Amino acid sequence: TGKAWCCTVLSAFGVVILSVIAHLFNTNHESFVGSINDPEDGPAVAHTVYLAALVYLVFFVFCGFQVYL
Amino acid sequence: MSSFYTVVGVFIVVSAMSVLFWIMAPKNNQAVWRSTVILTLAMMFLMWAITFLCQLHPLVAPRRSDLRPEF
Amino acid sequence: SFSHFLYYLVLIVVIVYGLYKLFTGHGSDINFGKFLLRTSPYMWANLGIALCVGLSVVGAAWGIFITGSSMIGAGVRAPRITTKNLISIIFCEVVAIYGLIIAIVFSSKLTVATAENMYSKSNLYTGYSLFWAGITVGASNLICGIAVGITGATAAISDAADSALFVKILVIEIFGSILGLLGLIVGLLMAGKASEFQ
Amino acid sequence: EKEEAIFRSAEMALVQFYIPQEISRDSAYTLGQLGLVQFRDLNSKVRAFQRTFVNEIRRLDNVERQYRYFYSLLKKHDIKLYEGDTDKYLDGSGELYVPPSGSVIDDYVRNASYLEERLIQMEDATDQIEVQKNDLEQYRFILQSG
Amino acid sequence: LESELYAIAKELDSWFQDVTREKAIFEILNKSNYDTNRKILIAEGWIPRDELATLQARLGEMIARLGIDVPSIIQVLDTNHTPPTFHRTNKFTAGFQSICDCYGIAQYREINAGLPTIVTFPFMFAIMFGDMGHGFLMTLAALSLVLNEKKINKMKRGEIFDMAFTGRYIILLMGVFSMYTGFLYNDIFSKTMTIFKSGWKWPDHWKKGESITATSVGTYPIGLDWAWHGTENALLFSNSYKMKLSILMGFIHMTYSYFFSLANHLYFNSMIDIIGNFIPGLLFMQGIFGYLSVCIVYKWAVDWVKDGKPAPGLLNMLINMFLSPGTIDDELYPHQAKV
């Protein structure tokens, strides 16, 4: 029902937005670590964003079985 | 090659496709196709030319004191 | 009342303060001259540019809810009038366009001036003229925006009774819009001579 | 051919129908089946309260009034109006419909009148004793906790 | 009562409508003239000219079912009344035609303003909305309602949800064109795109907290060059850009809407308004804002730095030409005061 579509679509794009974000701190993209206020260490961040992105893949598959039934 | 002639180079290519589609459009809901496309290409073109002319000979340049010396 | 009790008291402090500095031999210390020579001439000009468009736009929007709120009333039994009585909404708006033009004319004159030639003759005149040009054009159009709205609701009614009454009343509402045009003129003759800041 | 009529309106003139009295009804249904015509009221110059076929229509709206009261009785009681799934079997499309005969329709106005009187009787009987239900059903409630 | 009511309820819905027709038929027969001495019923009505032949062919089949075969029951004349207005509409054009109708019913055989409204409306939404990230989301909720439209048609709906389904094709375009703009504005979730080379360039060396300024190399082909993001003086460029965009985009939308006047007077053959109404307004505003729109483009294709001349201002150029005509402060082109 509607209570699962919320966490489904949210977790769906959440995986797709966070995965691209992690790939950019790793590669040291200018817009994300080029300035001084931005964090200095890239891969110290991408290791944190993979993990958080998995958490949304948990709720995408978990509530993905519930809407199926 | 970056100059005002480049805009003119695309004004002709687009003002030619606009004529071939006047011809080749299907009869079924023909004014729907005919006016939709031609009217769309111009407003996609005008927003490209205006976005392009404002970069040729600018009067102010970007300035900042934020980058890292490694760049 | 309380808010009316203050107005009697502000008068009294100014009179005690006006005498204590006088019977002691200090009357020249309250010198409005230095308050006009030393204050920055940019303050007087950026008020006449905001009050002109400020007090004018209050005029237009005032006359619109006096006009529209009655047109909508008569148009519950006679809804044909919404397109014929629209004119009175135009004469309420145009005074705003009179103000928006002056603010752009006077914004041309705001320039940067040196520190030595700041408080000179040609720069104090400019500020003092751009100020009382903004008050005149912003107060005239503030009132034209109210005498047109009032006059615009009587025609919005009489049109609903019998249509023959409408055109006979615009001769009043057209003589109401002249007033907003006369300040627009006089506001410029002030600032026709004033030259931008050096 | 076919005019598109999206850049301008559709060009169209008005057309008269010298309709017979025998088939005054039967020809007019067909336009309603077709659904492409708008009529102009020449009879508006005459007053609205006195017109030709008022004896007919005045009879029918009273008959159509009563059907809404049949539906109302369904509302109060625990019943649902068993409805049709689609509207494709009432000749709403280009396919035609032969109009009913007068005997089909004279039965309807008849069926509207004698039917309800049975239903007005049965509901009065229920209401005559249902008001007796609540007046006593309350009388015991104060006694239970007496 | 209930077994009877159950019995009547199953029958009711069928012959509910069958009487509603039978009274409506006589409502439209009142409006005809019913002559008493002669059995003639005179009813006149409008019919689209494309379907004269369907009506002619269809009527003939009824009278064969009857055996009467009257000599004629059809004839057309021209009169001076006001005929009504009918535009043909499919699923796509209808949600855009429901908008222009609410303001006013169009005169007989004039321009429908519903065709240009298909594209100008959602494209102006893109100028404001203007972001690839948000515009992508609008498309999907319009890419869902559209595909499943056959399921959604049958089932019941609320009221907030009907308007979405009625305008499912309006929302599709607003999400598409919002992705083409944001690629030129170069915005996605407040971030930028770094595909092509930047025609700008930085120095070879600097230090922390030390201010720097760029050097131009070439031009950025498609959009706003990605070197502006994070910069100090960015808004001094976009503000002085997006203004001059909307002026030109307002000068074009209006005049295009204004030549529809010409293509109507040429239809009804009213030539006085061409010389009375059309042309004087053409010469008024084109001679003011057409002069304002053309000068803005000339100022951009002129390297005022190389020539050594100062770039003139356009507000003082538009003002002094009314107040102090024949005078200039900074020149734009030869014989400016002459024009």
Domain extent at residue B49: 1-71
For residues A21 and A37, the answer to whether their CB atoms sit within 8 Å is no
Amino acid at position E45, single letter:
G
- From the CA of E328, how many Å to the nearest CA of chain C? 14
Q: Do A35 and E230 touch (CB under 8 A)?
A: yes
Contacts of E46 in chain D (CB under 8 A): 12-15, 37-38, 40
Mutate to test the interface with B, among E88, E90, E97, E115 (most CBs of B within 10 A): E115
Cα distance between residue C58 and residue C145, in whole Å: 8
Of B32, B48, B53, the CB nearest to E184: B48
Of D6, D14, D36, the CB nearest to E112: D6
For residues C182 and C111, the answer to whether their CB atoms sit within 8 Å is no
The burial class, CB within 10 Å (0-12 / 13-18 / 19+), for C48 is: buried
For residues B56 and B2, the answer to whether their CB atoms sit within 8 Å is yes
| C-alpha dist (Å) from residue D25 to D128, E24, E36, E150 | 46, 11, 17, 38
Backbone dihedral angles phi then psi of residue E317, each to the nearest 5 degrees: -75, -35
Residues 6+ apart with CB under 8 A from D41: E31
**Backbone dihedral region for residue E34 (phi beyond 0: left; psi -120 to 50: alpha; all else: beta):** beta
How crowded is residue E172: how many other Cβ atoms within 10 Å of its Cβ? 20
| C-alpha dist (Å) from residue E144 to B29, C150, E149, E159, E333 | 25, 53, 8, 18, 55
| C-alpha dist (Å) from residue C193 to C187, C188, E275, E316 | 11, 9, 42, 17
State the angle between helix axes of E168-185 and E120-129 in degrees (0 to 180), rounded to the nearest 10: 50
Contacts of C104 in chain E (CB under 8 A): 315, 319
The secondary element (H helix, E strand) that includes residue E289 is helix E289-300
Cα distance between residue E98 and residue E91, in whole Å: 11
Amino acid at position E306, single letter:
K
Contacts of A34 in chain B (CB under 8 A): 67-68, 71
Q: Do A35 and B67 touch (CB under 8 A)?
A: yes
Query: What is the sign, positive or negative, of the torsion defined by CA atoms of C83, C85, C91, C96?
Result: negative
For residues E51 and D13, the answer to whether their CB atoms sit within 8 Å is no
For residues E42 and D18, the answer to whether their CB atoms sit within 8 Å is yes
Closest-CA residue of chain B to A39: B68
Mutate to test the interface with E, among C83, C108, C184, C188 (most CBs of E within 10 A): C108
Cα distance between residue E66 and residue D99, in whole Å: 13
Query: What is the sign, positive or negative, of the torsion defined by CA atoms of B11, B16, B21, B23?
Result: positive
Strand partners, E41: D19, E34
**What b/e sequence results for B19-47 when a residue is b if at least 16 CB atoms lie within 10 Å of its CB, and e otherwise?**
eeeeeebeeebebbbbbbebbbebbebeb
Residues 6+ apart with CB under 8 A from E81: D14, D40
Helix (H, G, I), strand (E, B) or coil at B68: coil
Of E41, E51, E111, the CB nearest to D19: E41
> Which two three-digit tokens encode residue C169?
């009343």
| DSSP code string of chain C | -HHHHHHHHHHHHHHHHHHHTTTTT-GGGS-HHHHHHSS-HHHHHHHHHHHHHHHHHHHHHHHHHHHHHHHHHHTTT-GGGGTTTTHHHHHHHHHHHHHHHHHHHHHTT-----SSSSSSHHHHHHHHHHHHHHHHHHHHHHHHHHHHHHHHHHHHHHHHH-GGGHHHHHHHHHHHHHHHHHHHHHHHHHTTTPPPP-
> Which two three-digit tokens encode residue C106?
């006077």
Q: Do E305 and B57 touch (CB under 8 A)?
A: yes
Closest-CA residue of chain B to E310: B59
Helix (H, G, I), strand (E, B) or coil at D86: coil
For residues E205 and B69, the answer to whether their CB atoms sit within 8 Å is yes
The secondary element (H helix, E strand) that includes residue E1 is none
Q: Do B66 and A30 touch (CB under 8 A)?
A: no
| C-alpha dist (Å) from residue E217 to B55, B61, E202 | 11, 12, 10
State the angle between helix axes of E52-66 and D24-34 in degrees (0 to 180), rounded to the nearest 10: 140
Q: Do E206 and B69 touch (CB under 8 A)?
A: yes
Helices marked H in A1-69:
2-26, 30-33, 43-68
Count how many residues are written for chain C. Answer: 198
The DSSP symbol for A35 reads B
Helix (H, G, I), strand (E, B) or coil at E292: helix
How crowded is residue E87: how many other Cβ atoms within 10 Å of its Cβ? 20
- Does B55 touch chain E if contact means CB atoms closer than 8 Å? yes
Cα distance between residue E280 and residue C164, in whole Å: 31
Cα distance between residue E64 and residue E59, in whole Å: 9
End-to-end CA distance of chain A: 10
Cα distance between residue B69 and residue A35, in whole Å: 10
Cα distance between residue B41 and residue B20, in whole Å: 13
> Which two three-digit tokens encode residue B12?
């002709």
- From the CA of B32, how many Å to the nearest CA of chain D? 8
For residues A25 and A43, the answer to whether their CB atoms sit within 8 Å is yes
The secondary element (H helix, E strand) that includes residue D87 is none
- Does B3 touch chain D if contact means CB atoms closer than 8 Å? no
For residues B42 and E123, the answer to whether their CB atoms sit within 8 Å is no
Cα distance between residue E303 and residue C64, in whole Å: 48
| C-alpha dist (Å) from residue E19 to D34, D35, D68, E82 | 18, 18, 13, 34
Breaks in chain D listed by the residue before each, with C–N > 2.5 Å: none
Backbone dihedral angles phi then psi of residue E79, each to the nearest 5 degrees: -135, 180
The DSSP symbol for E222 reads S
Cα C28 to the chain's mean position, in Å?
Answer: 34
Calculated CA dihedral for residues E2, E5, E7, E12, nearest 10 degrees: -160
Cα distance between residue E44 and residue E74, in whole Å: 10
Q: Do A31 and E194 touch (CB under 8 A)?
A: yes
Contacts of E252 in chain B (CB under 8 A): 46
Mutate to test the interface with E, among D27, D113, D129 (most CBs of E within 10 A): D27
Q: How many CB pairs under 8 A join A and B?
A: 11
Closest-CA residue of chain A to B65: A35
Cα distance between residue C132 and residue E166, in whole Å: 56
Helix (H, G, I), strand (E, B) or coil at B12: helix
Cα distance between residue C69 and residue C82, in whole Å: 12
Count how many residues are written for chain D. Answer: 146
For residues B17 and E153, the answer to whether their CB atoms sit within 8 Å is no
Contacts of B35 in chain D (CB under 8 A): 7
- Does A36 touch chain B if contact means CB atoms closer than 8 Å? yes
Q: Do D6 and B31 touch (CB under 8 A)?
A: yes
> Which two three-digit tokens encode residue A65?
């079985």
Q: Do E120 and B43 touch (CB under 8 A)?
A: yes
For residues E108 and D9, the answer to whether their CB atoms sit within 8 Å is yes
Q: Do B64 and E230 touch (CB under 8 A)?
A: yes
Q: Do E72 and D18 touch (CB under 8 A)?
A: yes
For residues B51 and E224, the answer to whether their CB atoms sit within 8 Å is yes
Helix (H, G, I), strand (E, B) or coil at E212: strand
Closest CA to C146 of C67, C84, C90, C51: C67
Strand partners, E149: none
Contacts of B31 in chain D (CB under 8 A): 4, 6-7
Cα distance between residue C18 and residue D99, in whole Å: 103
Resolution (A): 3.6
Backbone dihedral angles phi then psi of residue D53, each to the nearest 5 degrees: -95, 35
Q: Do D30 and E33 touch (CB under 8 A)?
A: no
Cα distance between residue A7 and residue B66, in whole Å: 39
Q: How many CB pairs under 8 A join C and E?
A: 8
Residues 6+ apart with CB under 8 A from E273: E261, E265
**Backbone dihedral region for residue E269 (phi beyond 0: left; psi -120 to 50: alpha; all else: beta):** left
The DSSP symbol for E304 reads H
| C-alpha dist (Å) from residue E328 to E291, E316, E321 | 16, 9, 8
For residues E111 and E264, the answer to whether their CB atoms sit within 8 Å is yes
Helices marked H in E2-84:
2-12, 14-30, 52-66
Looking at the 3D structure of chain B, how many domains does it have? 1
| DSSP code string of E129-195 | H--HHHHHHHHHHHHHHHHTHHHHHHS---SHHHHHHHTHHHHHHHHHHHHHHHHHHT-BTTB----
The secondary element (H helix, E strand) that includes residue D17 is strand D12-19
Residues 6+ apart with CB under 8 A from C182: C140
The burial class, CB within 10 Å (0-12 / 13-18 / 19+), for E62 is: middle
Count how many residues are written for chain A. Answer: 69
For residues E120 and E253, the answer to whether their CB atoms sit within 8 Å is yes
Cα distance between residue C57 and residue C52, in whole Å: 8
Chains C and A touching, counted as 3 or more CB pairs less than 8 Å apart:
no
- From the CA of D31, how many Å to the nearest CA of chain B? 27
> Residues of chain B whose C-beta is under 8 A from some C-beta in A?
66-68, 71
Q: Which long-range contacts (CB under 8 A, 24 or more apart) does E58-67 make?
A: E58/D30, E58/D34, E59/D27, E59/D30, E62/D26, E62/D27, E62/D30, E66/D22, E66/D23, E66/D26
| C-alpha dist (Å) from residue E158 to D80, E147, E152, E165, E244 | 21, 19, 12, 11, 44
**What b/e sequence results for E143-164 when a residue is b if at least 16 CB atoms lie within 10 Å of its CB, and e otherwise?**
eebeeeeeebeeeeeeeeeeeb
> Which two three-digit tokens encode residue E65?
């079912």
- From the CA of B10, how many Å to the nearest CA of chain E? 13
Of E46, E50, E68, the CB nearest to D20: E68
Closest CA to E227 of E218, E132, B49: E218
Closest CA to C36 of C156, C124, C155, C102: C124
For residues E127 and E174, the answer to whether their CB atoms sit within 8 Å is no
> Which two three-digit tokens encode residue E117?
């409204």
Closest-CA residue of chain E to C102: E319
Q: Among residues 8-67 of chain A, which lie with CB inside 8 Å of chain E?
A: 17, 29-31, 34-36
| DSSP code string of D38-83 | EE--SGGGS-SSS-TTHHHHHHHHHHHHHHHHHHHHHHHTT-----
Q: Do B59 and E311 touch (CB under 8 A)?
A: yes
Chains C and D touching, counted as 3 or more CB pairs less than 8 Å apart:
no
> Which two three-digit tokens encode residue C86?
């629209």
| DSSP code string of E18-36 | HHHHHHHHHHHHHTSEE-S
Backbone dihedral angles phi then psi of residue E213, each to the nearest 5 degrees: -140, 155
Cα distance between residue E168 and residue E144, in whole Å: 9
Within a 13 Å sphere around the CA of D143, how many CA atoms are in the beta-carbon half?
5
Residues 6+ apart with CB under 8 A from A12: A56, A60
In angstroms and rounded to an integer, the radius of gyration of the C-alpha atoms of chain D is 25
Closest CA to E61 of A53, B70, B61, D27: D27
Chains B and A touching, counted as 3 or more CB pairs less than 8 Å apart:
yes
Calculated CA dihedral for residues C41, C46, C48, C54, nearest 10 degrees: -160
Closest CA to E68 of D32, D101, D20: D20
Helix (H, G, I), strand (E, B) or coil at E268: helix
Q: Do B71 and A34 touch (CB under 8 A)?
A: yes
The position carrying tokens 């203050």 is C6
